[PDB]
Every structure is written in C-alpha cells, then in structure tokens.
Amino acid sequence: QNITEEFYQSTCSAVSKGYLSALRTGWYTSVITIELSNIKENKCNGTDAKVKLIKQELDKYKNAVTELQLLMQSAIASGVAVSKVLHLEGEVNKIKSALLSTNKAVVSLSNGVSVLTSKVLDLKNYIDKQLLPIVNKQSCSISNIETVIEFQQKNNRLLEITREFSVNAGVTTPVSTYMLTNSELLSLINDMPITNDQKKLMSNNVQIVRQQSYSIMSIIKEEVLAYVVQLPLYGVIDTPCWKLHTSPLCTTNSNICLTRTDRGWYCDNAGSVSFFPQAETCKVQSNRVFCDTMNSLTLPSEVNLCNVDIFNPKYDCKIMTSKTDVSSSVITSLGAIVSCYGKTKCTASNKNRGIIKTFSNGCDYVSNKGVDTVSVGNTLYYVNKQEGKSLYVKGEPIINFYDPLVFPSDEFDASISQVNEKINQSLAFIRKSDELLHNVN
Amino acid sequence: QNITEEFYQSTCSAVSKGYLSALRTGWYTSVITIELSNIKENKCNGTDAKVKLIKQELDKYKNAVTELQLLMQIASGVAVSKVLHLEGEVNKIKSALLSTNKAVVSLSNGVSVLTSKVLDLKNYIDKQLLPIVNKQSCSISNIETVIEFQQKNNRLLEITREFSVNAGVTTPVSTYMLTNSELLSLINDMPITNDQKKLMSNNVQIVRQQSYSIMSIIKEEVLAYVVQLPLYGVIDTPCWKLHTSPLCTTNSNICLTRTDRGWYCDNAGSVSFFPQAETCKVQSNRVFCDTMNSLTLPSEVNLCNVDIFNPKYDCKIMTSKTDVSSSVITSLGAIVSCYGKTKCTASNKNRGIIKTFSNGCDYVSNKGVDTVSVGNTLYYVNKQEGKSLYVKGEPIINFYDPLVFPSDEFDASISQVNEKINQSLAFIRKSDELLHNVN
Amino acid sequence: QNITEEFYQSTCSAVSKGYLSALRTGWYTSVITIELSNIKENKCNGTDAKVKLIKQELDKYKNAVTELQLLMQVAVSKVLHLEGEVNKIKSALLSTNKAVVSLSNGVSVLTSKVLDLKNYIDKQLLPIVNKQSCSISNIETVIEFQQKNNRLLEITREFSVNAGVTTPVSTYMLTNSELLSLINDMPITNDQKKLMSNNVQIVRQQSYSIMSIIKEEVLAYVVQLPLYGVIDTPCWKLHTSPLCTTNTKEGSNICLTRTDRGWYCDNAGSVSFFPQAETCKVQSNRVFCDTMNSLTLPSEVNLCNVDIFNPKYDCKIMTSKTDVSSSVITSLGAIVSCYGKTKCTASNKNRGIIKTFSNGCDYVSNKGVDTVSVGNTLYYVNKQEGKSLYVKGEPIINFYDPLVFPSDEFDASISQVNEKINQSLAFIRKSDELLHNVN
Ligand SMILES: *[C@@H]1O[C@H](CO)[C@@H](O[C@@H]2O[C@H](CO)[C@@H](O)[C@H](O)[C@H]2NC(C)=O)[C@H](O)[C@H]1NC(C)=O
Ligand SMILES: *[C@@H]1O[C@H](CO)[C@@H](O[C@@H]2O[C@H](CO)[C@@H](O)[C@H](O)[C@H]2NC(C)=O)[C@H](O)[C@H]1NC(C)=O
C-alpha cells in the first residue's frame, strides 16, 4: 500500500493518492433455497396439559411465515394301672395345651403376613398408579422441550433469516452471514463471470462486498424459504483513484474567497475520469476503493489541472464565491487543512496539547504525528481519533451439575437371599417333624 | 403494464415512461400499546437451586426494559401294655412338636426380616426417590414457564430488541411492529380517497419501507410506541425517470452532460423533481416519492429532452473541453457515448458481439444486448444469473417411551399369596376343632 | 427553549430559529471486551441420546464465531380314652404342620415378589428417573447459557447482520452506565459532557461499533463516539419555495427558487452549512450536525433571506421562465406559492376552509392550518392522528403439583405387623415352657 496526500497551497485543496479502483457496473443474482426442519409432534400428555410447547412454537413460526407471505402483493381302671395312667393323662394334657398355644402363634403370624401382604400391594399400587404416571408424564414434557430447543437449534439459520426479513420488509443490505455463508459467498464469487484477479480481490474483501450486496426475499412457504441474493460485479479493477478535499481560500490585499465545490472521489475510468459526488457511493479498505458507477459523472483528465489552477483554459472549474473573509478547517485522510483569515486565530497542537504551530493569516496543511488538534477560534477540530478507556466485561464459567440416584441393590438382595435362609430352614424343620409322625400308629 | 423508454439521440438522454405517482405529503400517527404476559414465579425447590430460570429470565427482560427507559431523556384286655406304647408315642409327639415350634420361629424371623425390608423399600421411595421426582417436576414447570413466556410474549420481545438496536426508532416498520391485519385496518382509517386506500393496501412493502416506528413509553409490563405512516396528496400522475450520458461534437471540442437526472413526476399543473434515488421507490409501474425535498418545475422542463438550448428553459448541463467517452445503464436498456479514440461494443446473451460503435452516442435494449464494453471497462445491461444454492433439512423426532408396570401379573401373585394364608388358617381351624374335642 | 419561524415574503423562504449547535469534529475510540461464560458439558446419558443439547448449542455458537472471524481479512373306658386322645393329637398336629407349610409357601412367594418390586425400581424406573435428571441438567445448562451470555449473543448477531459494523450503538454494545462513564472520560468541557449525557439517543445514533476481534471465548470491538468542537452556537433551518413576484434592475419577471436549503449554524465567526438532512439531527431545540462535509460561509449569507440580489452575496437560486405553483412544509407551518391559474386553499383542523390564495406566496402555521391544497395535490401541515391499536396479554401460570406419600399411615401398618410377630413369638415361648416341663 502507498497512500499519500499532497497539498496544493494555491488551491487550498488536498488530494489523497494511491488507491485502487473497483467499480460496480452490474449485479450477480443467486437464488438460495432453504428447507425447514419440521417437527412431527407427539401427542402424549405432559405435566400440565394447557402447556403445549410444540404446538405453540409451530404457531409462532407458522405465523411469522404468513406475515411475510403477505409482503409479496373316661372311666379309670381300678386297682392298677393307677398312677401311671394319670402320669400320661398329665403328659398328654400338657401337650394339648402347648399345641393350642402353637396354633394361636401361627394365627398371629398368618395375620401378620396377611397384613404385610395387604401392604406390599399398596406399595406396588403407589408406584404403578401414582408415581409411574407422573414419571412418564415428565418423560413426555422433556421430549417436548428437547424437541423445541432442537427445532430452534437446527432451524437457526432459517429463523435468523426470517427475522431479518420481518424487520426489513423483505430486503436487506449487508448480506448477513446468515443469508450467505462465507463458504457460500466464496464459491458464488467463484462462479461469477469475471477475471481471475477480480475474483481474488472480491475474495479478499468479503466485508465490502457484503455491504455492497442486497438480499431480496423471494418466496415463503411453511417449510421452504427462498430468496435472491444480489452481488456486485465490477467492470474495472486496479485503476488509480484519489480523494479530493477542499478548503476556503482568500487573498490578503481581504476582498475575495474561493472554495472548490467538487469534493469527493475521483478515480480513472476508460481514458476518462469518473467522479462520485458523495461518501455513500464509495467505500474503502486500506488502499482499496469501491465505488458505484450508477450515478457517477464522467469527466476529462483535464479536471486535474484544477488542483493547481482553477482558472486555466481547458477546464472551467466548479467553485463557490465569497465577498467576505471566511476562516475554517477541513480534516483529511492523512492530516488536515486550515484556512485562517481576517481576525481569526488558529493553532495546531500535538499529541499532548502543547501548541506547535500558529497560523499566519493564510491556508496551510498539517499531518498526523506532528498534529493531533487544530483550533480555529473557538471551534476545535481533531486530526486524530482520540483513544480512551477500554471497558471490560468479565464472565465466569457455567456448571452442568447433575447427581445420580443410586440403589443399595446388593445389600438388599443379601437380606432377601437371607429371608430364604429362614424359609428353607423352616420347611426343613417341618420335614423333620412329619417324619416323626409317620412313625406313629 | 406500459413502461417504456424513449431515447433522445440529440441530447444523449433517455426517459423511462408510464409510471404512476404517489407522493408523500403528510404523516399518519398511531399508537400501539402492548401488554406483557407476566409470569407469577413458583418458589419451589428445583433440581439444583442455584439454577433459577424464571427469576433469571425476568431479570434479563426487566433489564432490557430499564435500558430502553433511559433512552427517553371297650375297657379291657391287659391294658398296662397300651400305656407304655402310648408313652413312647407321647414321647415322639413331644419331640415332633418342639421341631414344629422351631419351624415357626424360623418363619417368624423370616417375616420379621422381610418386614424390616419392605419398610426400607417404602422408605427409599418416600424419602429418597420421591423428593427428586417432584424436584424434577418443579424444574420442568419452570422450564415450561420460561419457554411459554418467550412464546407468548414473542411479539413484544422482538420489538424490544428492534428498539434496543435502533435507539428507539426504526425504518421499515417490521411485521412485528405492525401486523398486516393491523396495517390494513389502519390504512382503512386514514383520511384519504378510496383508490388511495386500495393502492396502499396493494403495496404494503413500500409503505412499510416508507414508515417509521418511534418508541413512546416502556414500563415493565407495558410497551407503547408510535407508528408513523405516509400520506399521499396525489395518486396516479404520470412520472418518468431521466438518464443522461455525455454528448460530444465535431467541426470542434465541446462535451455536454445533462446534470438533472432522476425522477420527474407531474404535480398540480407543474412538475416535481426528486434529485436522488433515496426519495423514490418503485414497484412495477408504481412509484412513490417524497415531496419533502422536491424541486418544483414547469412542464417546459420537457423540451430539454429534445433541445437543451431553446428559449423557455435554461437547462442544467455540465461542460467539457475534451472528448469524454462512457456508458450509462437505464431501466430498460443502456446508453453509450463512444468518442475520440475509444472502442465500444455491445455483446449479446452469450457474448457474441452484436454492435460496434460509430464514434457518437447510441442506445440499446434487453434481449439484444446483455453487455457493453467501453475501452477496458465492462458494463452489464442485464443482471447475470448464476448458481442456485440449496440447503436441505431433514425432519426432527419426538422420541418418547413410556414406562409400564406388570400390574396384572403382580396382582395375580398376590391374590395368590392370599391363597396360602386363606389355606393356612383353614388348616388351623381344622386342628383346633380336633382339640376342643379333647378333655 | 424558544423555537420560531420567521417567513420572508420577499424571498418566498422561511427560517426556523433558536436552535443550539453541537458539531462533530472528532471521534472517541473505546475498546470493549467481553468474556463468554463457557459451559463444561457433562457427558451423562440423557433420555434419548441422539439429543445432545449442550454439544449442539456450543456448535451453533462456535460456528457463528467462525463466520465472524472470517470477516476480518354302652360307652368308654379311660386309657382307651387316652389312647384315642393321643390319636386325635397326632392328626391335629399333622394338620398344623400342613398349615405351616402353606404359610411358608405364601411367604416364599411374597418374598419372591418383593424382590421383583425392588428390582423394578432399581433396574427399570431408577435408570430412567436419573436419565431425566440428566436431560434436565442439560436443558437448564443450555437456557442458563443463553441467559447469562445474553449480551454477547445479542452483539454477535448484530455483527453477523451488519458485516461487523453498526450504527446506532445498541444498548447491547454499550450500556447507559457504560456510555455515561465513557462520556465522562472524554477530553471535553463540562457542559459538553452534560449535553451528551442528556441526549444519549442522538449520541448513539451518531456513533459506530466496529468489531475488533473474535475468539470462541472472547469478543472485543471498538466503539466510536462523536466529539464536538463547539456547543451552544445558534443554528437555523432554511426552507424555500418558488417565487414569481420579483425583478432586478430593468428585468421584469423570472421565477426563483432559492437553492441552498438546509441547516445553517454558526461556527468560528463564519457560518457552517450542511446541505442534506442526513448530516443533522435535532431534539427539541438541540441540533447536532457533522462538520465532515460542511460548507463554510460568511454571515453575509443571511442577507439572502431578505434580498437575493444585493452586493455582498451572490446567492444560489434556480430559474424558470414559466409560472410554477406549489407548497413546502416547514418545521412550524407551511409555505405556499400559488401562481398562474392554480387554486390554493388552507383548511383547518376539521377541514373547514379558512384562507384562499391570492396569486402570490404566503406562509401559514399550526393551529389555524392543518391542510393546504394546491390544485389537486394535498399537503398536510400537521401529522394526522388516528386510531390507537392495543394488544392485550393475560398472565402465565407456574402450575406445579407435588407427589406425596402416605408415610405415616403405612409405618402404622408395619409397626403393627410387628404386633403380630411379637405376639406370635410370645405364643411359642409359652408353648415351649410347657414342653420343657415334659419328661
Ligand atoms: C394420555 O392421552 C389420552 C388423551 O388425552 C389420555 O386420556 C385422557 O384420560 C382418560 C383415559 O385415561 C379419558 O377419559 C380421556 O379421553 C382423556 N382426557 C380428556 C380430557 O379427554 C390417556 O390417559 C393417555 N393416552 C394413552 C394412549 O394411553
Ligand atoms: C433353598 O433350598 C433349595 C432345595 O434344597 C434350593 O434349590 C436347589 O439348591 C441348590 C442351591 O442352593 C442347587 O444346587 C440346586 O440345583 C437347586 N435346584 C433347584 C431345582 O432349585 C434353593 O436354591 C435354596 N435357596 C436358598 C436361598 O437357600
């Protein structure tokens, strides 16, 4: 890059030089079509069924879409036996009583179990008919939420576009990175009917290009959105341009001032020079400039003599006139001009505000480093941008904080494999009891 | 649809004709007020209670709002015998019964334990699982609430953003600021003719681009803003667009470019001129301009298309001493001023060159011409089609799987444990009867 | 305040007066840097694991970031009776034994089944409970990422939509807090600071935000604020309408429209003129213009409001040979040039016609005039109010219902099953005593 400004004291004007043209002469259409990723909604019952996220998101969406659509148009021995009989009488009689006691013991236990059973049913029944429904009710609601999120996630680009269009009545400048991806833009450029350097220029300058392009909504249907992107095409590259700035000029033997009217970008076209009257039409990036033919004015290279002379055969030369002294200042790409006339005081101050130059009732130029500020009378002009105060906004990190539920399975299964100890034990006791009795007859 | 261009070789200029005016002369105010749908947050305990969605969403929101706020300012046969055989018998029974007793002990301890355990099962449920089920139940209620807040408050939120990004004023009036339904009935209410209304209705897009929305007042639960719509003081006047290219001469050394380009368009007996694009937009043969900065001029302006020099109108122009060659693209073709040493070329659709340029100033049109080149600069008379780009989507899966319990088969086992108890009791029943027969 | 318009009949032009300047002459850079609040994702298994919200959101985000990055470059004896007795007892005991068998098998089953209940819980339900517990952790994490990273996200978008540079500096790029203190740090006078502070809106509209550098976890951009090198000078707005009543020095007719409309406004002993709206914005009696393309002119310009022709200033004008009639709306009323055959009308609030126009050039004002018509074109001097639109919202329901367990009533049953065992053991206890008394 080799940008320079050269100041023309005799015309109180300054030109910035060393820029390279790129001039729109046309447009490249392209038709981008986007499928929605649709949800098929799963009619279950969630926790609270006035809540219907999926239904609702769809409506929200569908509606946006309609909105846009609208834009388009006993008896006892005796003697003996004696005592013995009655020993057995006594023994038997104990046993009877002991057995009755046992019976009532088994009744107790039976009723115990009858109840523990009665209760285990209820435990099951809580689970099956109380908890379990609202577990897998949640399971549903979650499936919904997930679905919704994932709809916005995967349909992101479409949605972004949809908004963009809603907010712009279906037409945008800058072609957002949602309308066109870099990858896309880049290959799209590739496909343009232009020279190879041209392609490379465009590729190394996506920002400008986007700023220079439009996106027009084409057609919206619930499940497809298509729009036309509109890119610039340059009919010339690499011709030199220059920016002209202009400040009033007065004699001193008083009486007359001149300000040259025609400021802006000049920039060579086919053997002739194209002039673009207002910022608007041009953007610039380093030593690269990009302007739009559309409204340009075509003029002869003889325009240039106006930087030196004004009055000179060859070009009448747009100007404005004053009878009275006017003083002021004009900031350029690479310094500033200052026209200090009549009674007015002018000052160039440096980086730290120390005053370096002071102004001899005429028209001078200064530049960055050296000059940071000029004042004319009470107005202050800043030759450089004033740096100040960074602001900083910190973030912490965010916590996926989950804690599983876990069951004593093993220790429990122990207890049980051990209740079976007892039954297994019990049965074997009876087994033994019965043997003894099938030995009685 | 009768748009045309007629080229004026003697003024190296072209006019696009057959357009119909609509010219802004005023504004139509309307005050749109929007209620927020507020959440009443339900202080439960969610799964992890550093997480506080509803509280948090509300703050986000509330804050946006503050921000905007700030923008505003039999008895026999020796029997002794039997006795002793009964004595051994008794003695067996004793032992047998003890064995049974120990059996009932075992079972009792079995149950004592199975009981001890069923309690624990219940207790896991009640005091372990059940909290964190209906903790989840809470967090979900929240999430749902949040989502549904964004859903139902959508339009408001969209607006709120729009305003934050635009410091409280927008052009295009979005479909979020104004619905078609709304815009339409609003138009209906405007103090204009009926055709006028119909024009507006059949052109919403332009209208919206021509309208503003200004934020009026924001309160946590209400937002109100003023929409600002255009009003046309005239419809259906012809307009035309003028394009203009340099014109040089021979017998020696003057070049003319007509300065005054843009839209002309008839007003009350006189003609309104709008200097820059900006002011005008156009849809088919319909044009919409803004008086605001217009210049009013006499019909006599028209003779300038033919003559330039002529009594009646001094005529805006710029001057060159030296030959200047170039090209200018029109609505419906192109102009090309080929002068001095420069070479000029019109090529067709496929780039086959059709015309080559006789050192003057000519016009060409679409079909026929696709491209003109002046020296090394290339101009495109038509937009170049290229490469559709396509971006596919699949469809997305609501993927839920219920949990279900063997209820019947379980209830079977149980209604069947009761088999055994019912059975057991009856066995004892029988035993007892036999004993109340012993005395 | 004190805004006024004074109309100059002899120049068919009107000036609005009493505004106070503020004029851009520099910029103030500041570099804002924003940390992302990052998620450390928790690789669990959720309900359906094709779903991966956190992974997915991050990708969405990370991608936006890459995109932006790319922008940058007879009956019975005893004994016989005892005999029979024993024999009864045997049978009765057998019956008891089979009773204990029944109960044993009953328990054997109830046990068999309680295991299954546990196992459903442990191996069926419990996994999918704390699968949901995971999925929720995720959803929450996602939401909370958008919530806490809100500002950054809003910015990221804004930049994506504008190819990395915006005007209005949104409240998301700069908070009022920030803007305010930023202003405070600017190298300007105190009144100046106060001005800016009482006018945030304009300031914002006058500022730019340029994206500076993007990394996955930090975004930094430069805000660019205006600096005025003069405040509190008077400015005035000039409006201009055609004039057919005129003459110079033996020069009969000619119709004149004064070219140089827009904002004038005093600078260092000279006057700065800003040719198009664009450059200037205004809030009450406060005006804000941009030096950048201004034209510096002598106070003598003002005589042009009175004379046009006068030594001292040649005076930008345009010319017509022919009568041109029209109307021009001003800040505080309207001008109307009614010439030749044309009919002109001022109507009030309700459309009752007040004035009718004597073939010259007049001014009117708000209250009094609401409408002027020139021929068929209608101009609106005031904005037409109409129809408020209203959009209601209800409030939204956090609707949660806890699950609760009969714990007490259950524990009652069980503390009561132990009644029975406790009872049963005691019955055996008593049985055994009786038997260790047999020998
Ligand atoms: C969940 O979805 C259905 C449909 O709503 C549920 O049915 C509801 O409740 C009972 C049936 O258990 C019915 O009397 C009603 O028809 C439903 N309620 C209403 C208000 O209509 C059912 O519980 C679940 N569905 C399935 C397929 O098992
Ligand atoms: C209770 O005892 C029974 C019967 O004696 C067990 O069943 C058998 O026992 C052993 C395992 O302890 C195996 O070798 C056999 O193959 C089993 N066969 C069948 C067909 O069941 C029973 O497993 C025991 N249970 C407990 C918990 O002690």
Ligand SMILES: *[C@@H]1O[C@H](CO)[C@@H](O[C@@H]2O[C@H](CO)[C@@H](O)[C@H](O)[C@H]2NC(C)=O)[C@H](O)[C@H]1NC(C)=O
């Ligand atoms: C177990 O036994 C109980 C009580 O003895 C049964 O209750 C029966 O209920 C009906 C009700 O109409 C009565 O007519 C009978 O008197 C009862 N039956 C008997 C045999 O006494 C109960 O149905 C039985 N339950 C199970 C699960 O087997």
Ligand SMILES: *[C@@H]1O[C@H](CO)[C@@H](O[C@@H]2O[C@H](CO)[C@@H](O)[C@H](O)[C@H]2NC(C)=O)[C@H](O)[C@H]1NC(C)=O
């Ligand atoms: C069932 O039996 C046990 C043991 O006899 C009871 O526990 C005892 O209760 C008393 C108080 O009443 C305490 O002083 C003892 O220290 C306990 N001892 C043991 C070994 O447990 C038990 O509480 C009884 N109650 C129920 C409701 O089952």
Ligand SMILES: *[C@H]1O[C@H](CO)[C@@H](O[C@@H]2O[C@H](CO)[C@@H](O)[C@H](O)[C@H]2NC(C)=O)[C@H](O)[C@H]1NC(C)=O
């Ligand atoms: C769930 O948790 C809340 C608060 O987090 C509970 O409030 C508790 O109240 C006691 C006093 O009774 C406090 O000392 C504790 O700070 C709270 N407990 C815990 C575990 O944090 C309340 O029990 C529940 N609240 C709701 C709304 O359901």
Ligand SMILES: *[C@H]1O[C@H](CO)[C@@H](O[C@@H]2O[C@H](CO)[C@@H](O)[C@H](O)[C@H]2NC(C)=O)[C@H](O)[C@H]1NC(C)=O
């Ligand atoms: C949940 O499921 C994962 C997903 O596979 C689990 O990985 C387990 O471990 C083995 C390897 O040792 C895998 O092949 C199995 O799929 C899983 N088996 C079991 C018994 O859990 C893992 O435990 C969980 N999550 C993560 C992120 O690892």
Ligand SMILES: *[C@H]1O[C@H](CO)[C@@H](O)[C@H](O)[C@H]1NC(C)=O
């Ligand atoms: C750009 O700078 C060079 C480098 O020395 C200088 O010689 C020249 O004057 C500049 N460019 C042009 C086009 O004159």
